[model samples]
Every structure is written in C-alpha cells, then in structure tokens.
Target: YDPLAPSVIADPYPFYRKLRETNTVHWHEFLDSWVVTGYAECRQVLGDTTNFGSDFRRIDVEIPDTQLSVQSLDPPEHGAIRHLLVSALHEQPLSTVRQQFAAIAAQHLAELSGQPGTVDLVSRFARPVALRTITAFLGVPPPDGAGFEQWSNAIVRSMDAGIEPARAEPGNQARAELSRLVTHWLAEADERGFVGAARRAAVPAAVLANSLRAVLHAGYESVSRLLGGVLARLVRHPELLAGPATRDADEALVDELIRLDGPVQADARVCVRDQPVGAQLVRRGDVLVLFIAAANRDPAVFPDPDAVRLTRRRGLHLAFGRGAHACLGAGLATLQLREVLGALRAGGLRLAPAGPAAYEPTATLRGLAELPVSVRA
Candidate 1:
C-alpha cells in the first residue's frame, strides 16, 4: 500500500488488515521495507531490541537527533538514556503529578464553559491543558517563542522524512529551535523538576541536550495528539466517559480509547541480525516499518478490535508499545487524559460533534488536527 495515499492516511486499518492477512510481515516495494502488522509479530519486533535495532544510524542513513534521540538507541545505551528520563518523570510522586495537572484542567473547564458554542478542543481544551501541565512537569520556563507546538508538530511529521523528503528541512529547523531551548535548560543547575533531574546527570552536555529535546518533543505534542485523537471518539461515544470515577475504571477506558485511536501509526527500524519473525526471515540491514496502529487492531489479539471494550484486559494493547523504547510519556499522557475526562464528567458537560473531524496529513502519526464540538450543559 502507498502510505502517502490520502485514503490510507485517513484510515489505514483496512490496509493493515489486508497486509496481516497476506503475511504478518510483508515486503512492500513502495517503501522498500518489511511491514509488520500482526499483534504478536509487531511485539516480537519491538521486544527484540537486540536483533531489530531502532538505531537508524546503524544503517548508514543519517536520521536527525530530532527523530532519532534516546528512542532510537540500542540496549545499555538506550537503557541509561531511558532510565534518566523515566526517573526524572517520576521524581515527583503520582499524587503530586495528578494534583498539578488537575489544577490546570479545572481552571480550563470554566473557560470552556464561558465560550458557549462550538470550541475546537484541539486548540482550546486539549492543547492548553497539555501545554500548561507539561511545562510545569519540566520545571523550566516555556520556550521563548510562542510556536513550541508548531515546532514539535514539525518534528513529528518529520518521522516520515524518508518517505516525504519535503518535511526534512522544516523538521530540522524546528528541531534546532527547540533543541536550543533544551540546551539552555541543560546548561543551568537546579533540583526541582524533569530538567533538573537531567541536569543533575553526569552525562555529556550534548547527550543531555538531545535527551531533553526528545523530552520536549514528546512533552509538547504526544499528549495533545492523543488527547485530540481520542476526544473525537469520545464525542461520538460520550457514554464511555459517563461512568463514575475510579483510577482502575478510568485507566481501562483511557487505555481502550488509546488502543482504538492511537496517534502513532507506525515506527521504522533496521534489522541488525538474521532472524525469523513468525515465518518471515529478516536479514541484517533490512528496513522494517512496524504498523503499530494495525497491530493494535489485529483481530487475533484484540477481539472486535475496531470498537472500544473497557472489559478487555488492560496492558495487552501495545499503544504505548512494548520493551525498552515504549513511550516515556505514556504514564503522563494517561494521567492527563483521565483527569481531563474526570473534570468533564464532573462538570456535567456533554459534547456534540460540531463538524467533521480533521486529522494531520502525515502517515506516521494520526491526530485530530481540529476537534470541533458544541459543549452543552
């Protein structure tokens, strides 16, 4: 399938299903990469960090630090970088994190209430809440410019730089803009938040700078993207958000929604060893494009995969991924989404779709570019 095709980016599950049916791992000549779509097969590929290297640098293609920071490193190497970010993320207790995010969300609820008509939650509710919360989590002033979101979006679309050569330069410019801000934060010394934790690490200046760029890249947009993506569905199915709150219940619903509407569609990697994934033999240096969106829907693992079923056991879905490189922001993303939903339900707010949902045109990432909905009392 041509990933750049409009219809495929709009909705890629059918293509993924077809690929899984033909072969869980099928070689696509258009992209010249093995497309792995099955749930188990994709898990095998992501989990085998040893054989399936995420380090694109290994293949002689120069992927920028913007798209290839800590997430792309191999074991022991990727492990330490990941640990620093993870611990920095958890430096504060979960209760503390929730309290801080909830405070901002509650303030936004009143502003949304006053607006009185169709409000694109992408800009109004989802993004504002994400921006305020992530900035607080990092303990650094918001970057000097007002375009942090735009710059982050640039890097995300750049995930497809190999397929879409046009995005490369703009993505590089955005990375430079944000990385400069990260460099500023890393140069300072403090012991308050995420940036402080990274600063306290004994790593080289360049390494810490790149890792924080990765953190900023994710902190700025992954929550916004996932929040925007899932809210479109919640507006369609408000009943899912209607239940009473329990961390367990909210966690199940949020995870299910994440599974059904994950913002990340695929990830690229290079094979470093000869290995068989299912029945397909992959040789060293072969490129792979793992269809995470497709695998999340594989009927073999997720029965009735097209719809959300909170009853389905949690942790089975790979929306946050498996193994070492799983998203550093998954926990934060979940907590933020749950708290936002909790506030909506508590406010007795109901949502009606004001217009058709629009998503970013990129193939690698899928998020509602705008979520227009009329808020009702």
Candidate 2:
C-alpha cells in the first residue's frame, strides 16, 4: 500500500466504501496499507494505542520535526501536552467572555449579513473568525497575525507533505518559524504574567506555545470551515432554518453537517500486527485509511445519506472519532457553533449561497477554498 499515492491523495472515500464492503479491514495495494471503515473496528484501533501507535516515524518520516506534535503522540507525552493545554484554556473564563465573544461574532456576521452581493464566506467570514479568535485567545500581539498564518500553514502543510509534494517547501519554512515563535511566546508569557497566568506558571514556555499552536491549528481551522459550510447548507435547505432563536438546534444537525462535509478525509492507522478484525485477517505494518466521511454517509448507517436532515439521527458516526482520539475540542466547537446559531437567529439574518461552493484539496482535511454567500434580513 502506498501512503503517498496520487489517487488516494486526491479522494479516498469511494475506494474506502469498496474496501469496507469487502471487509471491515482490508489491505490497500496502492498504499501498501489496510483501511478500517466500520465504526466498532475503527474504535478498537484507536483504543489499542499500545499496538496502533501514533509514532509515525516508521510509517512517515519524510517530514521534519513533524512527529513532535501532540495529536501524533502516544500516552505520557500526549497526556502531558493535553493537560497543560486544558489548564491554559480553562483559565480564561469563557462564560465571562461569552458576551464579548458574542459581540465579536455578531459584528463580523452583521457586516456579512448587511452586504447584498456575493461574498466568499471562507475568505471573509471563516478565515477571519478562526484567525482572530485563536490569536485573541493565545494573546498574540496584533503585529504577529501574518507570522501566525505562516506557522499554522507550515504545520498543516508539513503533515500533508508525506503525501503531497506541493506542501513541502512552505511546510519546512513554516515549521522552522513555528519553533522560533513557540519559544518566543513561552518566554513572553513568563515576562508578561498574562491573562492565562496559571497556565504560564504551570509549564515550560516553549512547550506551552507549541501546544497552544497545535490547538489553534488543529481545532480552529477545520471547525471554522465546518461552521461556515453548515451555514451555507442551511441556506440551501431553508426548510430546516426555522428554530428558536435563543437555543441550539437539534444536536443531530451537527452530525448532518459533519456527514455532509466532514472536516478531514482519511485518518491513518497502521495495523499493529496480523489479527482478526471483523471478517478480514489484517497483517502487521498495514496502514489503514479510516474514511469517516464515507462511513457517516454509508447507506447502511444513514438512509438517503446524501439528503440533509435537520432531524436525522445519525447513530454512532465517526466524525470526532471514537474512543481515545474523540476530539477533545468537541465541547469548544459546540460552544462556537451554538453561538453562531444564536447570532444568526438573533439577527434574523437570512443567507443565500452565491454559487457553487469550492473546497481546498487535502486528503486529510475537507474544507472550502471559498464559500460565497449573500447575507440579508
């Protein structure tokens, strides 16, 4: 199985369905790896971290300093990184900042909603909201926005570079820049004793900075795109738009949005060793492309999967994954989404999509290159 193969690189979902139908786990001749698609089997792989390790040096070693990121780490290392981050995030009281966040969100949306013509939602709304919110939370100086983009882009590119050649150059440059910035932020935190003082006091500056950057890159980007895309979809499915302006809509809508356009395409899992997984016998050193998007929309799981349903009960989807790697950012994402919903409702802002939506190409992440929408009363 070729991990960096072009066809798998472009879109692995269609092939994933064929593989899943054959077996819950089947080796892909292209990547020289196996693919795990079923809900239960995928969870088992993630849970047995000991065997299915995150250490991808054996699996993907082309990129530099890529392995150090927390999401790609195992046990003790990941735990330490996650703990520090949770402490820092918990420090800044979200409830206290709720109104402030709402105001920020409202101002941005109001501006978009006021505009009559087509506006690229990703460029105008998604990118700005994510970048600004993340920078604000991290206490970045106003001047550092450009650098932040460079670093964030680098991390993402570097990770994708194993399978994507275009990502290599900027990915390398970005990783270097990020290392420097992480060091600088950590040192600055000590000197400043800032808003997230508890976190600053708890961990090494460099470590903390990297962790925060990880959170920013991982959590914000995909989630923002999902939020914007969901809004666009709601405009298309206007029938689902009716809801209490004050409350979060059916939780199922989150599943629907995720199933419709999942944030990431395929998550990589290397087979620990030969074992009986579902109906198939898996071998050691096999990399499994876990296609969450395909599983979410599979006819077996969701009837009329292509159709959007605000009321659909998408049971046990793999959006956040399951078991250990189930997105830690889930709660924060929910908060941001609910707030957007509240703002859209409060403003009574009606949205109409500008034209055909476009997506940035990444096997690992599914997001729009641009989402243009007109906002009106």
Candidate 3:
C-alpha cells in the first residue's frame, strides 16, 4: 500500500512525505525495494561501500559498458576507468569552451525569440546547449554527424519506464552504432599516430573512446533536463528567478535547485546476500530503491525541508551519490550547471511562465519532456 502507484511517478514528492511519516527507510511494494529517504541515511548508505554496494547485476542500457560500468564497479576497478575520464574533464580549458558554448546557446535562444516571445526551453535552448557542449568535449570535429543525437536519444529513452520497450529497441540499435563509431575513431586515431596535443598523450586509446561515450551519456540529456527543471522550479517562485541571491549566490541557488528537485529521481540496487541490521531483517537477493529526491528534503537533515532556501544548511547531499560508486561525471555536471546560470546572468535574462511545465514520465530520471519559457530578449 504505497502512495506512489505507476500513475504518480510523474510527481512523487507528495508521496515522499507519506513515506517519511513512519521511517526514513521503508520497503516499496510497487518497486519491490527498500526506499531510503533520510538525508543522513542516504548519505551514510552512499558512503558505506561495505554495507551497500553498486555491483548489481542488471542490464540498464542507458549507461555504457560491456560488463562493468563505473556505476557497477567498486574501488580499484572503478578507479582505473574513472581516472581515465577524469583527466579529460580537466584537460580542456573551460574558458576556451565557455564562449563557444555561450555563443551556441545565445544563437539558438535568439532563434526561438520572436513575436510570441515564448519558446520551449527544453527543445530550443537546453537540448542544443547540451548537445553542442558534449560534441565539443568529445572532440567531434565539426560536431555534426549522424548517430550522436540519435544514439543519445535512445540511451536516454531507455531510462523511461513507460518507454522501456520502445526505447530498448533503439537503445540496442544505438549501442551497436556507437560501438561502430568508437571502433572507427580509435582506428583512425591510431593510424594518424597522435592528433591532439595534451588530451592525446594524457589518455589511452580505449580510455579516450570510452570517455567520449561517457561525456555524451553523462552530459547531454541530464544537464538539459536539470537546467530546465531548475528554471521551472524558479518560475514557480518568480522573485527567486531574478532575485538578488541569483546573481550574487549562484552556487547556493544551484544547490537548492538540485536539492529541491533531484535530477536522478531514484536508483536500484540488488541485494547480494541475506543481511540483518537495525529492527529490519532483509533477505538476500532483494532489491532496494534509493529515493534521493525525498532524502534531499528529509526534515531530519533539513528544516522546513520542502522550501528551497538558498541559505539552507549544507552538509552532504547524495545527489552525486557517494563511496566507490559516486558519480565520476559530477565535476563536469557541476561545471555545466555553473555555466548555465552564468549564461542566464550574461544574457540579462529572466524566466517567465511561458505556459505550463510538463514532466517526463520517468521513475529513475526526473526530466522535463517539455518546458516552455518566456524570455525577454
């Protein structure tokens, strides 16, 4: 008897309160996993690799990897793969790319501004910004070709519970296509000896290929969705959209937005063995659903939890997760977030309700399928 039936997946925050009323950790019959909502518990769970692990046996097509992903690997193995990509993230001069990204963003946004003075931010602005930035990061010369966006779309679609079947087909298709592209690139890079100055010498060929995939997979859709969601949240509180705090305290605002509406709604972990702890006894082979969105707002860690105050206490948030399984792309994600807010500031823009914001039907990822924004240009 859970509050969030399949119909409630679109907006699960209301049910979050209902679940938190009794305990921070509760078993979800619908999802068939224990849902942990307390910020402290969520943080603890994420940090303690011994108690909980990320090495789950599941076939999630969204994340790339043949057998193990940074998501499913622990310690030394995860470290190796993460280290490869981490350098690439820091290798590029953000200042060099910032203007490029802003120009691309500004150009696209300008196109959407017209007589109606309203544009679908998700479609016109956020998506393009993400796609372009990821393209640049991947060193995709020209940055426009077949398979990139289509592959990205399939990968993103596979995460949607409602669209799983339709998405899986494309997800599989895109996966094969991606493998082909990666193979071709590696051969070409090897044939040409070395092309790039710094990035080439810093990373291995396999690492380079995988890292490119990771960049697109990690950055493309998630940031777009997150930016749109953040703006949508601000629109509901119009003063906050262009508030004094926004200009002065951009980091604080980003944290609040992340806390209020978690981009990653929930993640699944399958049990490895029977375990006993606290008042609950759990059997082996059980699945757990970690509700990070709810945990971010748990009253135990946050006072007046639901409200998005820029000044709210900040200790630890499980948004990027923790332990050996923490998000490797977190640094890049934060960079994109900072740049997004910076663009808004540089553009002298403010968000007005274009019409209505709509949520995508996804239990795992909270994204805006469509969010129209009114911009003054």
Candidate 4:
C-alpha cells in the first residue's frame, strides 16, 4: 500500500500494523526508501549514528552552502548546536513556560467556546494557542495570522523536499522570509529575551539566527498538530474525561494520547555505511524511514497497544525520538499540551464530532486539517 495516499491518510494505523507484522524492514519501491516499522528496529536505527546519519540531504544534488542546522548535523557539531538551544529553551524555566501557556490556552478556549454552534478546533483554538505562545517567547510580535501560518506551512512542507518537488518554491520563499525576519528581529530583539540571551552568551549572529528560525518553525508546526491530535482523541473517547481530573491527571492523559498518536509519524536517517538491519543489508547513502508512529504502538512495548490508558505510565517511546537527534522542543511540546489539556478540563467543555475529521496529506507528519466539534456548554 502507498502510505502517502489519501486512503492511508484517512486511517493509517491498520496499515501500520500490517507493515510492522509482515514487513518490519520493507523497502518501499515507490518511495525508493527503506521503511522500518518495528519498535526495536526503529530504536536501533535512531540510536546508532555510527552507521546512520541524520542529514537526509547529504546525498542530494545542488546542496546549499548555508550552515546546516542541528536537525541535519551529526555530533560534535550537532551536540554543540543542540546544547545552545537547550540552554536557551531552559533560560526561561519550563515551569514559567507552563504557566505562560496555561494562560494563553485558557484565553483561546474561552474565545473558542464563545462561538455559536460548532467550531473547528484545529484552527479556532489549537493553532492559534500554539502560535501565540511560541511568538511571545521569541520576543517577536506575532505576525499577521494568515501570513505566519502560511510561512510555517511552507517551511514544514519543504521538509519533504526531495520527495515533493512541488513544495520547493514555496519552501524557498518561506525560508527567505524567515531569514529576513530573523535579521530584522535580531536588530530589534528585547535584550532580556531568548535571542538576546543567546547573543549575550557570545553566540555567533548567524548561528543564533538560524537556530531561532528552526525553533519557531519546529515549535508551532509540531505543537499545533499535537494539540489537534490530542483534542481529536478526547472527542473520540469522551469516557476518558467522564470524571473530574486534576491538572496533573490531565497532563498524564496528554502523554498517553501522544504515545498513542504523535504529531510526527516518521523520521528519516540516511545510512552512513553498509549496515545490516535485521537480516537485510542497507547500502551506504540509502534513506531509512523510521516509522515512529507504528513503533509507538508495537505490542511488544505497550500492552494493548491500540488502547489508550489515561493512567498508563510507560517508558520512553519514539514519539520525540532518541539519542543525539531527539527533539529539542520535547519539553516545550509536552508543557504546551499539558496546558491545553488543563484548560479544556477546567472549562468543563465536552466535545463530540460535529463533522468528519480531515487529515493533511503529509507523509511524515500526522496532523488533521480540520476537526469540527460540537462543544457542550
């Protein structure tokens, strides 16, 4: 089955189960890549950087001369860039971000609930809340809604670069705009803010600028989709919220929901050398598509893998990945989700599907385009 097709987008879990069971390390002819679906296998591919690389574009023609960001680098360069980002992210303690986001989420929920009849939670609440929080933290005034959203969409779509030539132009345009904005903000950024903090530490201007661009794009895109996914799950299983849950309990539920279906469905790592994955030999420069969503649901790791347990506490999953390239914004994503979950619970808002949910046609990123819901007073 073609994983990127609309049919699969509508419902991918059943197909993912099949892939994990029948073809744990199947080579997808259509995509010309290796698909690793088994949880253990995915962990191996992600953790072993000696044989595999994070820079998927290393084999691409016409590579840019611009400095590669942490997402596309291996240590010690990756380690250095990631260290800078982690320090900056923690500059404002996660607890502070949590409190700030909680207020933001609450405000969005209030506005969403004030609407008549039904609301598309993806846009009306989830997207807006995520964008506001990230922009505020960057010390940059929020861009016009449509403008920023368009830029974010283009930049993320560009991540699928080689696979989708159609996305190249918009991606380039967005990248240009991002660079331009970063330059502008650097000159005008608040001295007490994140950009300022990084600068004060003697970070090179170019590196700081690129890192901020990456953070802003990564922050909103993933968190927005994650928020959409969380809300969609809650609506589908109303019983999950049948009783009053403490904020901490709600946060735990958010983790379980993410474990079940995270925003990132897959991650690509290029084989640095000929390596054996299971019984199969992957040649150097081959792309290995790690099916993280499928791995998260592997029955071997999670009991009743398809089922969501609000009280379930499990070990680390590949949702945020592993090893050196693990998502830097993992803490921020979880904190924001926890805030959104708390806001929903506190609002006494019960949701039911008002219409069919639509999925975006993205291969690696699993996100809903629209999730219309009937909000109960």
What lDDT score belongs to each candidate, Candidate 1 first? 0.80, 0.63, 0.63, 0.79
Angstrom error at residue 265, model 3:
0.7
Comparing 1 and 4 by lDDT, which wins? 1
List pairs with backbone clashes in candidate 4: none
Question: Between 2 and 3, whose TM-score is larger?
Answer: 2
The number of clashing residue pairs in model 1 is: 0
Best by lDDT: 1
TM per prediction: 0.94, 0.82, 0.82, 0.93
lDDT of 3 by residue, 122-237 (tens): 77777777777665655554244334655766666676533245656776677566666655655454322111322454424544555455545666767767777777776667
lDDT of 1 by residue, 267-368 (tens): 777898889986789988998888888999999889999987878987888878888888888888888888888888777777889998877778887777
What 10-residue stretch in candidate 3 is worst by lDDT? 189-198
Off by over 4 Å in 1: 57-68, 144-146, 188-190
Clashes of each: 0, 8, 0, 0
Residue 125, model 3, lDDT = 71
| lDDT digits (tens) for residues 234-350 of candidate 4 | 888877776457757766776788887688888999998898896589998888999999999888888798887666665557899999888887877777777776677789877
